[PDB]
Design a protein around this ligand. Structure first.
Ligand code: B12
Ligand code: B12
Ligand code: B12
Ligand code: B12
Lengths: 195, 197, 197, 201
């Protein structure tokens, strides 16, 4: 797999060769393909390696900053459609960005105007922006479960006309308790908007 | 349209959630002022106005996030378009506890524009891990950007002294005294940083 | 619409005089393939297709001018974004009589992407003036791109030999023997050129 | 650095091969004088000073090339920022044999600033190929910039006639008589050129 190659280039600080390997993968598998076969497998392997204590925090930072940059390029290539926006973010306390960015990307690939805000947005401020921009939906990505548990019952229900929760840190019951529609796969998300 | 007006236009586009218009105005600014110029005359003035507005309680966190996430994305684009030389890298990051990342990215960018192989790691790197990577890659220098002063104050004396052969601290959160205490070379302007290396 | 058809789209936009559409298509390609990629998979294939069309008598020289002026402008943008390192410069140009400038610009760009301070002079520089500037600036190398062979053939033996400490000749109009005759190092690929310095 | 010193500074940076410093000084000029202003107060004065220096034998051709390639790059960015209107284009170029291209770019820029879709082709376009492109694009006008007079003199009588319904020749290398001989309207000032299209006569 180009996965091991990509990781090894990043770990030796070869950002030029890492970029070249990613670009080859994008040319070979296309935009959706490269995410499934390269970006996510590498991100998972970086996390695992760190958990095993095989790499330190600096190396993980390097890799994650790089993958985030590639995903941002893909986001930018999808363009930004006009229309009532969908705000994409993470719950308060959640700092991980890639799951939200992936969600924004899948929406944008299907012509949905997904505004990625960045992570960790307070719920009242998110509700206020959704209202001001006449947003049709809010989408939330949770990697950790703790930030969801800290939230009062029904706290996600009124953020916008539709509210979607996904990510490892989320499950059907916590979604029900919080008042959000739970969603496992990213492909289905655009269809779930009924447009 | 007018160069004299791009800051206002960019801010207004971001606040109404017009990412397409924002992108077009940034591109215009890049064409007008060039790579370094757009950062001085557009990106930073807008980022500062967003931050100020938030401090005055005029805008909420969500709006500020939108704008900052956008500006960060543009600086990353510029970073990628700059040359990356081979040779002993310079690691660029922020002190432990510092989450703001634009100042570090700006530093990496100015270095890369001047032929210095600056690896931006992202923010908030533990010092032992930073030291280990600097040693493994044979880094010639470590550059740290601090916007807040608190994260610097939490560090023990001489904590930045042996990170790499040269260690640079800058950002508004830093000053010559805190640099001396922590064992880093202070610098104020990004212009001078490439010459210093 | 599919990336592998950006080439035909770009060509069609240029031929109908749609500079705005051309710019948009090029930017899409840059986002898709990145800086080096867009040159390999869009700029060069389109420039070759313009040349072929001209050979088939489908378009005149004015259309070729339009397209090449456009591509030169895109390459210039990329050149500017790579930034210009300090240090002993490398002068990049074409032999006297050679007016085509894209191969030289491509060479300058690949060098600049690798931190080498490549000064693109433009095409068609007299050899005495080139030698004088190389000496005044303490240039480490001169790089020449030749598309046509005629301008090379008009030059006396050993005419490129003392232009600077290293002298490189490339381009389809050049081969190892004409390089040897003229006193330059020949190379085929732009990738190898940075390593060679 | 002060505005009254930008011209000298820019030239000196270019002559020592300091492209980074040159870029920074041009941007300072843009900040001071704005887009059109920088052309009048910085770009043209520097281009003229490069020419003068070359005449006085103080710089060779290599240095002039460096400087002109730089200024052409700046002017191209300004051209692109003027935007590209829709409609029947105006082709802008130089006569065959004319290699200087700044005058043509300046003409294209003034037209584009006034909403005219000026397509800058680059310099030195053979007249039959220019005629063919004007016809293919349905161009309403062709504009030619001549710095030198010799390339005009080499052209046969009536050689610029009917390249398009309107044909304009300008530049110091051109005069009313050579225009008449070649079958073009002569024009002195760039500002008037857009109006010269809107109201025909
Ligand atoms: C990679 C990783 C990291 C990386 C993060 C890399 C990055 N993303 O920048 C690093 C090394 C930094 C890391 C550190 C930490 N993480 Co970690 N690490 C992982 C790992 C190996 C993979 C996580 C992952 O796949 N995330 C990527 C996202 C995109 O995938 P996902 O959230 O599963 O979501 C999928 C779908 O739901 C969909 N999706 C995502 N969002 C949305 C939204 C919608 C609406 C939809 C429809 C779909 C969707 O896309 C994804 C495709 O599969 C796991 C272990 C494992 N085996 O999974 C943990 C794990 C998530 N980490 C964990 C922990 C504890 C941490 C740390 C606290 C460790 C520490 N002590 O410092 C820190 C900080 C976490 C934080 N503060 O957020 C725990 C979580 C435990 C829990 N929450 O109950 C895990 C499970 C491992 C463990 N220790 O058991 N981690
Ligand atoms: C933008 C901003 C924010 C934004 C940040 C958005 C983002 N970037 O993500 C937001 C609203 C989120 C924010 C948040 C906070 N910030 Co604030 N806000 C600002 C502002 C406006 C900073 C401008 C900025 O980002 N500049 C970034 C870089 C470009 O600027 P710089 O560091 O001065 O860098 C220059 C040079 O130093 C050089 N440089 C940079 N790095 C290096 C390195 C080297 C080696 C060299 C040579 C040069 C160099 O490059 C730059 C050239 O212009 C200031 C007020 C102001 N007008 O400056 C505060 C300010 C920094 N914020 C402040 C505060 C208190 C906060 C918060 C704690 C608010 C809060 N109370 O919760 C939070 C932080 C949360 C946390 N991490 O703990 C204080 C900090 C006081 C201190 N220094 O300890 C400031 C100074 C406001 C004040 N009180 O006057 N803030
Ligand atoms: C495009 C083209 C032109 C264009 C140029 C404008 C344009 N570029 O679109 C125009 C219309 C001017 C043209 C016309 C002519 N050219 Co023509 N045309 C071509 C064509 C199709 C493309 C090749 C090309 O120009 N690439 C552009 C450059 C950048 O790429 P390159 O030169 O291959 O260089 C590569 C490498 O060498 C490297 N490189 C470049 N410089 C350097 C420097 C260094 C140091 C290094 C390491 C590497 C390096 O990078 C480049 C890309 O990888 C080829 C046919 C083909 N090859 O498919 C001919 C070709 C070059 N043309 C040819 C001919 C015949 C001509 C004319 C004489 C035609 C005529 N019959 O009158 C005229 C003369 C030009 C003039 N009158 O001023 C012949 C060359 C003669 C031969 N050796 O047999 C070719 C080979 C095709 C053929 N018919 O046989 N041409
Ligand atoms: C710079 C310069 C050069 C530069 C050209 C710069 C470039 N573009 O690359 C260089 C050094 C290459 C050069 C070349 C030569 N040029 Co010279 N040099 C000059 C200089 C200083 C200015 C030329 C210039 O500014 N052109 C740029 C354009 C924008 O200026 P412009 O033509 O005045 O255009 C204005 C208007 O005409 C109008 N305009 C332009 N186009 C159009 C089109 C239309 C439709 C309209 C309405 C208006 C319009 O807009 C412009 C701004 O207001 C003059 C000296 C002087 N002016 O006193 C000579 C000068 C014109 N050059 C001269 C000539 C002919 C040459 C040379 C042949 C010198 C020689 N005798 O050996 C060389 C030839 C080398 C070559 N052919 O490549 C001599 C003429 C000698 C004589 N007749 O007595 C001059 C007059 C020097 C002098 N003071 O005597 N030159």
């Amino acid at each position: 797999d180009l996965g091991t190659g990509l990781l090894e280039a990043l770990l030796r600080g070869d950002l030029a060769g890492a970029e070249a390997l990613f670009r080859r993968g994008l040319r070979f598998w296309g935009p959706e393909g490269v995410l499934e076969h390269l970006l996510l497998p590498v991100l998972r392997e970086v996390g695992e390696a760190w958990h095993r204590g095989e790499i330190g925090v600096a190396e993980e930072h390097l890799a994650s900053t790089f993958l985030r940059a590639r995903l941002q390029e893909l986001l930018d290539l999808a363009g930004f459609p006009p229309g009532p926006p969908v705000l994409v973010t993470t719950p308060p306390g959640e700092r991980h960005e890639i799951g939200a960015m992936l969600a924004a990307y899948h929406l944008r690939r299907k012509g949905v105007p997904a505004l990625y805000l960045g992570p960790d947005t307070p719920l009242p401020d998110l509700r206020a922006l959704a209202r001001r921009l006449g947003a049709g939906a809010v989408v939330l990505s949770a990697v950790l479960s703790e930030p969801l548990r800290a939230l009062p019952d029904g706290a996600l229900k009124d953020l916008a006309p539709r509210v979607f929760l996904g990510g490892q840190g989320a499950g059907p019951e916590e979604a029900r308790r919080l008042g959000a529609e739970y969603m496992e796969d990213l492909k289905g998300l655009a269809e779930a908007l009924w447009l």
